[PDB]
Amino acid sequence: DRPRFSFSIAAREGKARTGTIEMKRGVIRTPAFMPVGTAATVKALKPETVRATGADIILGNTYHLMLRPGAERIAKLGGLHSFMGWDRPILTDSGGYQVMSLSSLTKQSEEGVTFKSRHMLSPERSIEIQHLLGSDIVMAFDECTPYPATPSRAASSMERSMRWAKRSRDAFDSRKEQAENAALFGIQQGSVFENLRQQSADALAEIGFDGYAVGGLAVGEGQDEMFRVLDFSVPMLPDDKPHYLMGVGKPDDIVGAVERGIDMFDCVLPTRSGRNGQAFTWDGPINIRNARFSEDLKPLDSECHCAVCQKWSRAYIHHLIRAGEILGAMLMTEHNIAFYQQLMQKIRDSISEGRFSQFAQDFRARYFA
Amino acid sequence: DRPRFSFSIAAREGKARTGTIEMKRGVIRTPAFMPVGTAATVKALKPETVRATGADIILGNTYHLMLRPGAERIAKLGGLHSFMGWDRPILTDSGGYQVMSLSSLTKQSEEGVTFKSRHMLSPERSIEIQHLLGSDIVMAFDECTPYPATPSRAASSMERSMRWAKRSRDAFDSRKEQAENAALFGIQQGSVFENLRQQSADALAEIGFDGYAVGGLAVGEGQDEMFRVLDFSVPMLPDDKPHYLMGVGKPDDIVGAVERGIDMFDCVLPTRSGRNGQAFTWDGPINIRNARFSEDLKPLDSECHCAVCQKWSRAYIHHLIRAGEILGAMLMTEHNIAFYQQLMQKIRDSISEGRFSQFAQDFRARYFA
Ligand SMILES: CNc1nc2c(CC[C@H]3O[C@@H](OC)[C@H](OC)[C@@H]3O)c3nc(N)[nH]c(=O)c3cc2[nH]1
Ligand SMILES: CNc1nc2c(CC[C@H]3O[C@@H](OC)[C@H](OC)[C@@H]3O)c3nc(N)[nH]c(=O)c3cc2[nH]1
Ligand SMILES: [Cl-]
Ligand SMILES: [Cl-]
Ligand SMILES: [Zn+2]
Ligand SMILES: [Zn+2]
């Protein structure tokens, strides 16, 4: 039977790695893209469809599920896996992003954050909620530092997050069933500052985690800056554990982040922008609502192996999205998630074969032609 | 290979019949429920899912498709079947209901109806649009008489519909490809008046059609009145051709209509009310949004064989619908359409076995308990 947690690296090329995370509920192939299913659903897809696209793991969110339908309620109903019908690993974010994104609803202190009906999150309560959900990969309760941030404020925020990381570790470890069956990831903060990123990495490594997320990016800094920060930040993390870049991203963001040592990704882009009419293709994104697609009999993408591209035309999907039809959202979402998984597969295969740098070059040349 | 059209009756019980319609694109088991797919989609379902529920045929609509995406456009793209990915029979309504339901947009004359951007429908143009869509069962262009109607106005409307029925027949017959590959149904009108229903039936039988719809019902008259009209109206139609009750209906409406000799049904109830939170069960409809379902682990219906009832709880679907999640619409719709198909299967089997009257009694006793 599978272990609680084992990360193995099978092949490398430069800073890029490919391998597997084995967990009780399944194997996760890395680099991995994790579809976002915040409210106990990957929007517009049955779990079987999410799996058919190639996803090994999906995300839920402590903050949203705490509010609706409720963490205790989900536990009473048998846990998130049973509730939504996904039996493979689930990673749950801790609420630390919402501490920032919904800060106007908040009162913050060293103890935690109260959101206003009032709901409280703290390292202890966040870890408890993730336990009640039956999360496989539990995220430490952090604060995603706003961008831009002054060095003083970035330091204060990071320091608090590191104290919260230790509290998260201790809360997780004290709950035997959780400690024995789930994994815990720490989240590096420090904004765009190398010295703070180093202090954060050192603090997290001293505490010790099963994996390490790069937090505080994909918050408006832009790709050049994000890549600059990754250049120095990822090498600070333990090499032998997974590296998870939270919130990233566009296909080219993912490719460049893998080149910089990232193993795991989540983003709402394929799902949300799919519902909005944006389809990803190897020749770049298209907006299916555009009149130029009204009589286009080609599939969304000419090479894509997904069920949508096997069966339906751009013209039909154009009609559905223009008409506000639910099937339009379903088809766009399935295609985009499948596209993302095919990207990850090509990345994994190219690293395995020692031709990832060539893949990255070819990918960019065509995607941005 | 299958004929253009052949209706065979395999078994009877009282006025009820069960059998098959064979057409080039497939066999339709009768009594049949036909899911409504007005805008080239059965809302929230892939065609494969519609088929998996047991549907043999679906409906499209001349009026809606003429407006968006356009009839000529669909023809250019290869026809409605290819466009939406449903390769089995499709019945298209003619626009005659919209003549009534959207009458404020209209200017009516003996030639046809113009809807106001202006779009025209006439017997000739309606039949042409249905050809462009590649419809298998083409409906005559009629007017659904408003309810209530005075005897004078009901007569005038019916008489015009009968003149339009002859024009529909001639338009269909003059188009060789359509005449050789599709079927044409006439629509009986006459409101709630026996003498007018008789005149209409006689006129339609004289013209001759492949099947006969009972039009002008399910327009607010209520079940007692609808059944009273069916009692005398259905026997007026040719016995050896299918009888199609347009727009019906709730499960008990369907059962009573089959008892009165109806072979085919369409209704938006399972799809539309499903999206609104109403689930059909053998113990009557439930509204899944009700707080009583928030922690109910049972499936929507205790006996239902559908994929939704095999996998997900009332509690989960309650959460999805409350949250406005697309998957909620998908799951409710699949279940309701599957329920309707299971109802039709039970009806067909019970007639075949000579126990339909007992089935109707048992069904009602439990559904209305
Ligand atoms: C978009 N860029 C981005 N996402 C980020 C997320 C996930 C948000 C999470 O919130 C929900 O979406 C709103 C999703 O929850 C499943 C998502 O994974 C982060 N989470 C934490 N805990 N800390 C961070 O520093 C952080 C930074 C991010 N940057
Ligand atoms: C609900 N009761 C009801 N429906 C009816 C329909 C279908 C409406 C059609 O319009 C679209 O839905 C709005 C659907 O189109 C596929 C539906 O089948 C009718 N169609 C014609 N041609 N003539 C009638 O006398 C008539 C009467 C009806 N009573
Ligand atoms: Cl999303
Ligand atoms: Cl509908
Ligand atoms: Zn595709
Ligand atoms: Zn069901």
Contact A46 B322 (CB under 8 A): no
**C-beta B143 within 6 A of ligand 2:** no
DSSP codes joined into one string, A82-122: HHHT--S-EEEE-SHHHHHHTGGGEEE-SS-EEE---EEE-
Q: What is the resolution of this structure in A?
A: 1.2
Q: Which of B297, B315, B327 sits opposite A44 (nearest CB)?
A: B327
Say if residue A93 carries a ligand binding annotation.
Answer: yes
Q: Tell whether A320 lies on the interface with B, counting CB pairs under 8 A.
A: yes
Contact A294 B327 (CB under 8 A): no
Inter-chain Cβ pairs, chain A and chain B, closer than 8 A: 82
CA–CA gap between residue A303 and residue A316 (Å, rounded): 18
Say if residue A304 carries a ligand binding annotation.
Answer: yes
Amino acid, single-letter form, for residue B134: G
Backbone phi, then psi, for B259, in 5-degree steps? Answer: -60, -20
Domains detected in chain A:
1-369 (3.20.20.105)
Contact B77 A41 (CB under 8 A): no
Active site includes B173?
Answer: no
Tokens read off for B210: 């492949």
Angle, helices A251-259 vs A223-233, to 10°: value is: 20
Q: Give nearest CA residue, ligand 1 atom 1.
A: A247
Measured from the alpha carbon of residue B216, the closest ligand is 2
Give Cα separations from B60 to B57, B67, B93, B129, B137 (angstroms): 10, 13, 7, 11, 10
- Which atom of ligand 1 is nearest the CA belonging to A96? 22
Contact A325 B294 (CB under 8 A): no
Contact B39 A325 (CB under 8 A): yes
Q: Count Cα neighbours of A220 within 13 Å in the Cβ-side half-sphere.
A: 7
- Single out the catalytic residue among B93, B210, B253, B263: B93
Start-to-end C-alpha separation, chain A: 47
Chain B residues closer than 8 Å to A329 by CB = 326
Check if the beta carbon of residue A35 is closer than 8 Å to that of residue A58: yes
**C-beta A139 within 6 A of ligand 1:** yes
Catalytically annotated residues of A = 93, 266
DSSP codes joined into one string, A261-280: T--EEEESIIIIIHHTTEE-
Q: Give nearest CA residue, ligand 2 atom 1.
A: B247
Measured from the alpha carbon of residue A301, the closest ligand is 5
> Which residue, B289, B287, B281, B307, is CA-closest to B45?
B307
Name the residue in chain A with its Cα closest to that of B48: A311
Q: Which of B85, B316, B323 sits opposite A312 (nearest CB)?
A: B85
Q: Tell whether B70 lies on the interface with A, counting CB pairs under 8 A.
A: no
Return the SS3 of A297: coil
Q: Tell whether A325 lies on the interface with B, counting CB pairs under 8 A.
A: yes
Tokens read off for A51: 């799996």
Say if residue A319 carries a ligand binding annotation.
Answer: no
Would you say how long chain A is, in residues?
Answer: 369
* B351 CB burial (10 A radius; 0-12, 13-18, 19+): buried
Measured from the alpha carbon of residue B313, the closest ligand is 6
Check if the beta carbon of residue A61 is closer than 8 Å to that of residue A38: yes
Give Cα separations from B115 to A49, A128, A146, A165 (angstroms): 41, 61, 55, 66
Chain B residues closer than 8 Å to A45 by CB = 327
| Secondary structure in 3-state letters for chain B | CCCCCEEEEEEEECCEEEEEEEECCEEEEECEEEEECCCCCCCCCCHHHHHHCCCCCEEEEHHHHHHCCCHHHHHHCCCHHHHHCCCCCEEEECCHHHHHHCHHHEEECCCCEEECCCEEECHHHHHHHHHHHCCCEEECCCCCCCCCCCHHHHHHHHHHHHHHHHHHHHHHHHCHHHHHHCEEEEEECCCCCHHHHHHHHHHHHHHCCCEEEECCCCCCCCHHHHHHHHHHHHHHCCCCCCEEECCCCCHHHHHHHHHCCCCEEEECHHHHHHHCCEECCCCCCEECCCHHHCCCCCCCCCCCCCHHHHHCCHHHHHHHHHCCCHHHHHHHHHHHHHHHHHHHHHHHHHHHCCCHHHHHHHHHHHHCC
CA–CA gap between residue B196 and residue B214 (Å, rounded): 13
Per the entry, the structure determination technique was: X-ray
> Which residue, A276, A250, A283, A281, is CA-closest to A265?
A250
Name the residue in chain B with its Cα closest to that of A79: B316
How many angstroms from the chain centroid is the CA of residue A126?
A: 18
CA–CA gap between residue B70 and residue B80 (Å, rounded): 11
Return the SS3 of A214: strand
Amino acid, single-letter form, for residue A100: M
| β-strands A278-279, A286-287 pairing | antiparallel
Amino acid, single-letter form, for residue B305: H
Residues 6+ apart with CB under 8 A from B278: B285, B286, B287, B288, B332, B336
* Dihedral angle of Cα B230, B232, B233, B237, to the nearest 10 degrees: 120
Which of the 8 DSSP states describes residue A141? P
Q: Which one of B246, B253, B264, B267 would you pick to mutate in the ligand 2 pocket, going by the greatest count of ligand atoms within 8 A of its CB?
A: B246
Q: Tell whether B272 lies on the interface with A, counting CB pairs under 8 A.
A: no
Amino acid, single-letter form, for residue B257: A
Enclosing H/E stretch for A211:
strand A211-214
Contact B46 A330 (CB under 8 A): yes
Chain B: nearest CA to A80, how far in angstroms?
A: 10
- For A184-325, where are the alpha helices, taking DSSP H only? 194-207, 223-233, 251-259, 274-275, 307-311, 314-322
